[PDB]
Amino acid sequence: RHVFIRTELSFIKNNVPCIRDMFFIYKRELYNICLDDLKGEEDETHIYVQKKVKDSWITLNDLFKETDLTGRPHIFAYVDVEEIIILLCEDENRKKDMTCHRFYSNDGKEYNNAEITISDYILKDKLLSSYVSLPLKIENREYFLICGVSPYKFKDDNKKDDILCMASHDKGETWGTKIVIKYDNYKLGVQYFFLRPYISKNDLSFHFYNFIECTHEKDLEFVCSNRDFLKDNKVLQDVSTLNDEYIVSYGNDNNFAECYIFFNNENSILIKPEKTTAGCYGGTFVKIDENRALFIYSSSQGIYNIHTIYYANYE
Amino acid sequence: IIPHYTFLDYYKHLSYNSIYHKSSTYGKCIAVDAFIKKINETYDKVKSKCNDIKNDLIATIKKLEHPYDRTFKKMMDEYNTKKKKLIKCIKNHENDFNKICMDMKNYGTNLFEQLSCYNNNFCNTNGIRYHYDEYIHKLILSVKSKNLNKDLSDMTNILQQSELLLTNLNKKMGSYIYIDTIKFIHKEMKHIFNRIEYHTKIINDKTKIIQDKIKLNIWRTFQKDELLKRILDMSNEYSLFITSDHLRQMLYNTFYSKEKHLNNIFHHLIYVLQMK
């Protein structure tokens, strides 16, 4: 019923494209993690950490000079407002002894690096790619996690071996904690794809290619309950929350043409990237505080366009 | 060849189950096991004459199953035309195959002559007891030792669940000729699933028939010709038993080797095309 939603728009430019990009709030500064997924003659890994200073992306610092060639890799950043820890580990063929490397900064430019060695990682026969994560407090400390999903099981022998979450305790220095998630909708022969765990308000949430709202069970064993967001060709692609109720966008087709956003089944406004020959893919419900939000997708080559949200409750 | 395999193993049991009436013949199994060597030589090497280009055809399955690590139909034509070359190779070494198995008719029945009796109203059962028990009954405990019915529930679930990955993942991936090759492998394991399935019904029916018939054979007598009727009859129980289980182990090895094969195929596609 009684909600006032102040929505608004902004514009970014970038000279070269970056396909998969990461977005967050650090000290209320709009940041970015670029993609150069080109391993060819004239391009290598070139991951530029970009702040949009009022018009367009400004690379605060690069990342390729520290980790020389290791690896593909998979990027994981934890958003503390004073510090962000970045690790890089490559794609899966034999080795579990996996020397990776660790990053530290308090700004976007001046980086401290850290040689680590995650040898015999327990994500063998687990599947992960890059995503943004947050702290998450269980009773002792806030915690950082790395959650490898089982894509396929022949038999539903146990609902504990689905998502395997190695957790840290010391910003990501040592990962001496493994966390179990229970998934109760485990339909066999349906190989679940590309898990995206986001964090909302010291709670757990997994999302993949369905949505599962997720909760604590034990110190290490957790659970996810089921929840619908599916309608006629209306997949779920990203969701944040304000006041712990969801904000929903859609992938209406297979082209990711123009995403569809509703006012929580009360009203509706429309994403309009034409008033070209492109889409609304990569949409990022960037979370600010209890009452404000942002939205940035990827339409075409080097053009990002912000959709800014102001939202509190009058009654 | 399956009725030849029944035929060879059948006359092996007419052979031995004939020649163990005479308890002084405990060393003739060197000669007849040496003829099992002979039929492994002649039978197995004649059926490896086809494994020149059939071992090359196993290498052609290698030509198929990785580009790295339309022509489905078009070289499927070459595959089935060279399968007319398969049953053609069986068809023109067929001279040799019939020579081998009917030579097992020869040495087999000439070992059936070697049984005798002191009197025909009642004879020894040192034979079927000593050879069934000391050569067969533990294999009877092998196939009795396995719940291959709940394992048919397993392999049934393998085709069910593999049709679920085929359903949702063909429903998603589709794109290149990978789906056509995967479907060829899947239907192959379904035909083999039929083989395994009915020969498990040979286990459930026929193994119970070994249980029923096994009381009328050893530790007893007959008027001699009825005892001989149970040498031939129980030799048929042994023929379908052993033939069915050796089929079960060739298709068991090829089966679960293919289970790791298509298992890493379902753990092989997202690693390449990188979904999202």
Curated annotation (Swiss-Prot), chain A:
One of its GO terms (cellular component) is microneme. Keywords: Cell membrane, Cytoplasmic vesicle, Disulfide bond, Glycoprotein, Host cell membrane, Host membrane, Membrane, Secreted, Signal. Disruption phenotype: Conditional knockdown causes loss of cell growth and severely impairs merozoite invasion of erythrocytes. Attachment to and deformation of erythrocyte membrane is normal, however the subsequent step, which triggers an increase in Ca(2+) from the attached merozoite into the erythrocyte, is impaired. This is Cysteine-rich protective antigen. The keyword Glycoprotein applies. Disulfide bonds join 18-34, 89-100, 147-165, 214-224, 259-280. InterPro entries: CyRPA. Glycans are attached at residues 112, 291. One of its GO terms (biological process) is symbiont entry into host. The keyword Glycoprotein applies. It comes from Plasmodium falciparum (isolate 3D7). Potential candidate for the development of parasite blood stage vaccines. In vitro and in vivo, induces neutralizing antibodies capable of inhibiting merozoite invasion of host erythrocytes.
